[PDB]
Write a protein of this length. Structure first.
Ligand SMILES: OC[C@H]1O[C@@H](O)[C@H](O)[C@H](O)[C@@H]1O
Length: 293
């Protein structure tokens, strides 16, 4: 066994591969040994829970984790906190009310300001549409996930700001590229004059671009993603996507590791009612243009 463990959502998706690299790089800078694990894919909430439960019985001083849902990791995290494990919530906010109800807490929460993520994606949409506005839609992440909830809210708030913008659809596609092409096709059929789609992550955004291409509307419909994964940025630079709100998963993972290494010295876990540290990693809007001076 090692000193620290990390439980990510997946290990096959680019966003979570980059977070794994950020953690590994930070492990060399700090000189600590980190074991990184993940479920098979995006739907295996029960498998990630059993994976976390199996780790809490080794000898890790701290465990950072990004839960697949706000609920699947509530019990194993609470049991790890009661055991004295230094816990750090990564990216996806665990249900803190239920975690407290289960008798647990976390040292810190390292994430992106996802309300600003959605606001930036929608704000870039509102500017590009101009005074005409038009119909817009929001492709949501998995239901109940605070990351997607916050991006949805931020996009809705920025859209409600402009009076010529119409929110005709807001449906989940479960971070799934195939599901997003299906949902986006439905939106194109039910709202043929739709002008722009914001997507809670790039996996879905690329699938939306597939649906837009099938309908022959590439460029007629704006497609803004989130994460800044390589395929999405190459799509943004090739015109297949309009933009993407890039996150910094490497820094999210690297910071989460350093917090466990630092707080490991404190000799004490966080009290049950002390609100955890709240670290925000900035996000930048990636378009095919890049402005300087
Ligand atoms: O794994 C699905 C998605 O989860 C969110 O919490 C992350 O911020 C990324 O957008 C990721 O792509």
């Amino acid at each position: 066994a090692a000193k620290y463990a990390v439980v990510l959502k997946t290990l096959t998706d680019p966003f979570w591969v980059n977070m794994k690299k950020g953690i590994e790089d930070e492990a060399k800078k700090l000189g600590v040994s980190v074991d990184i694990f993940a479920a098979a894919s995006e739907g295996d909430a029960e498998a990630q829970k059993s994976l976390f439960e199996s780790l809490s019985n080794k000898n890790y001083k701290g465990i950072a984790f990004a839960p697949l849902t706000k609920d699947n990791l509530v019990e194993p995290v609470a049991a790890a906190w009661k055991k004295g494990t230094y816990l750090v919530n990564l990216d996806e906010k665990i249900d803190m009310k239920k975690l407290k109800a289960a008798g647990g807490a976390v040292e810190a929460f390292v994430t992106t300001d996802n309300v600003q993520v959605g606001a930036q994606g929608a704000g870039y949409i509102v500017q590009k549409l101009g005074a005409q506005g038009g119909e817009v839609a929001i492709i949501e992440g998995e239901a109940g996930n605070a990351s997607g909830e916050a991006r949805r809210t931020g996009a809705t708030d920025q859209f409600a700001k402009a009076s010529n913008i119409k929110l005709v659809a807001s449906q989940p596609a479960d971070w799934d590229r195939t599901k997003a092409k299906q949902v986006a096709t439905e939106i194109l059929a039910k709202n043929p004059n739709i002008k722009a789609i914001y997507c809670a992550n790039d996996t879905m955004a690329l699938g939306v671009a597939d649906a837009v291409a099938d309908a022959g509307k590439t460029g007629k419909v704006l497609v803004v993603g989130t994460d800044g994964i390589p395929e999405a940025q190459e799509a943004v630079k090739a015109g297949k996507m309009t933009a993407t709100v890039a996150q910094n998963p490497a820094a999210i993972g690297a910071t989460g590791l350093k917090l466990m290494v630092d707080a490991e010295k404190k000799g004490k876990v966080i009290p049950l009612d002390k609100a955890p540290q709240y670290v925000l990693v900035a996000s930048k809007l990636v378009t095919a243009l890049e402005h300087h001076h």
